[PDB]
Design an enzyme around this catalytic site. Structure first.
Site: not given
Ligand SMILES: *[C@H](O)[C@H](C[C@@H]1CCNC1=O)NC(=O)[C@H](CC(C)C)NC(=O)[C@@H](NC(=O)c1cc2ccccc2[nH]1)C(C)C
Ligand SMILES: *[C@H](O)[C@H](C[C@@H]1CCNC1=O)NC(=O)[C@H](CC(C)C)NC(=O)[C@@H](NC(=O)c1cc2ccccc2[nH]1)C(C)C
Lengths: 301, 301
Positions: B41, B138, B140
């Protein structure tokens, strides 16, 4: 999000660890430029270290830099540390300084044996100048350290374990933290208070991450709070600590004295089967800079 | 003596972290030999990564290694992991493996931002295939890993954070732990349970370090223990597990079914304001290997 006990990256320190052997004793050394630093009681077998150090020759000190034996071409004692000048400078010497930390501050520990790193973890300099480590026979010479952008501020060297299981050690200029000495004689650690300003950093970290059950709408004065801190063996709260908790307050919009009122209820009432940041006890080995580091992702190139 | 949540030395892994930029996404990559591994991603701005990817060119992929800008000479996708082939082999590449861990196993996470190590901590693969991390935006591309003598066994890469504040990710072959996907949909973690064999190992580690207030002269059957386990949200116990906790049992001279009876009575009565190893919770993030290796001083070359 999340809040863990985080240690600094240990790569910059790993490159420095060596093995010091003299007689029956093998411990860990720290090699920075042409000098190798170790605990002086490597020259023991209630001693007389000065007496013991003039009887030694340069050739009695065996220095392993891994698969490479280091040649000693000088020695000297600086309080409880042995400075062993060797014929090679360490190519892996980082930008460093030697600092002596205050109680309540934290640092990381690279545990070593035979010169090879075992593990890394995070510690606090308790108010009784001890630290609660993980050290076995042979760990001596391991060091504690913080990272400042690119700079390793070495702050601990390991020497001994006390009868309670806690540990004692010195700065890199050899001076023990607290009233401890490098002798198998008996000594008590002293009564450990709780680092109050750190507990309050840790609550700010809990608010930042969404544990908020412990918050209330009461407020308190520094004096009425500190009255309560000294009943729970917490450490007195100063205005300087209140100033340090500033940015944390401003971020959460919870005044410091307001958060002090939450620590009061928690103190008097307990936690009641709940947890804060995974712990069921009040955590105090997180300084306010630690919380901000972790809760904002400061790195170290 | 002492027992800490210890992490592996992270030196061999730091030399592998890099920035990977694409569009207005920035995250970390793992650079072994001439492949840089990162989450797919990064090419994101419910995507079809096939379509997103057939659709970048190599020069989209800004790969910074400190003050060095690595040219990407090709790419490909293995499940949720991007493989960026580059023209330079990393001179700091250690012996490594890619392994997939089982629920209950532990690893260290070198959190990273902009390719820069921020800090290192230890974690477990929960039984719902989550982990409880400290990851900010950031982070990831940060990797989880174990060490085995001289070999780095990468087991985890970070991709996301679930709404309850827990973290999810993949092995290094790209496959998610648990039923999560790298989409901004909604997934719930699923019911977490306590890694029973680890709790027992933590109890052994407490005995090995002298915490003695929780033991008793009762025993039970593996069945009647697991009966009570099911009632406290605890993973069942196997004979495999009993076999596994052997050497700790052998060292302490406490039969495993004896420690089960101690656990059984900690579970039905609780800890009663007492603490084990500085915690007021039954800690389940230490394996028998973790305990043995820390209470033995296994090092790593
Ligand atoms: C990469 O640096 C980053 C790390 C996140 C940011 C804050 N804490 C972390 O570990 N990754 C992301 O932003 C993710 C993007 C990929 C494409 C999944 N998304 C997330 O971790 C975000 N949450 C969601 O988007 C989320 C909630 C959820 C619930 C059920 C199923 C899927 C799903 N995705 C964070 C910003 C809350
Ligand atoms: C060096 O690697 C080693 C590190 C110890 C050993 C196991 N865990 C550790 O932290 N250092 C030592 O063995 C110390 C020797 C020097 C000369 C002090 N000693 C110890 O840590 C041992 N105990 C004491 O020396 C001891 C008893 C005592 C009583 C009152 C106050 C202080 C104090 N120190 C341990 C191994 C019992």
């Amino acid at each position: 999000s999340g809040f863990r006990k985080m240690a600094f990256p240990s790569g910059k320190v790993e490159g420095c660890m060596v093995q010091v052997t003299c007689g029956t004793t093998t411990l860990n050394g720290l090699w920075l430029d042409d000098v190798v630093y170790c605990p002086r009681h490597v020259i023991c077998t209630n001693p007389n270290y000065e007496d013991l150090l003039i009887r030694k020759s340069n050739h009695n000190f065996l220095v392993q830099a891994g698969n490479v034996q280091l040649r000693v071409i000088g020695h000297s004692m600086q309080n409880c540390v042995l400075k062993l000048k060797v014929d090679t400078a360490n190519p892996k010497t980082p930008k460093y300084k030697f600092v002596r930390i205050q109680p309540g501050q934290t640092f990381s520990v690279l545990a070593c044996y035979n010169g090879s790193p075992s593990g890394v973890y995070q510690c606090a300099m308790r108010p009784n100048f001890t630290i609660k480590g993980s050290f076995l026979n042979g760990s001596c010479g391991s060091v504690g350290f913080n990272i400042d952008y690119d700079c390793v501020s070495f702050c601990y060297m390991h020497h001994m374990e006390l009868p309670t299981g806690v540990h004692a050690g010195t700065d890199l200029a050899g001076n023990f933290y607290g009233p401890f000495v490098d002798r198998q004689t008996a000594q008590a650690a002293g009564t450990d208070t709780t680092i109050t300003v750190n507990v309050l950093a840790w609550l700010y970290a809990a608010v930042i991450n969404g544990d908020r059950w412990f918050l209330n709408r009461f407020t308190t004065t520094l004096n009425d709070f500190n009255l309560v801190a000294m009943k729970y063996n917490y450490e007195p709260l100063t205005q300087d600590h209140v100033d340090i908790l500033g940015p944390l307050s401003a971020q959460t919009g919870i005044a410091v004295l307001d958060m002090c009122a939450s620590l009061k209820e928690l103190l008097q009432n307990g936690m009641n089967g709940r947890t804060i940041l995974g712990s069921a006890l009040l955590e105090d080995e997180f300084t306010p800079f630690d919380v901000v580091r972790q809760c904002s992702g400061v790195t170290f190139q």
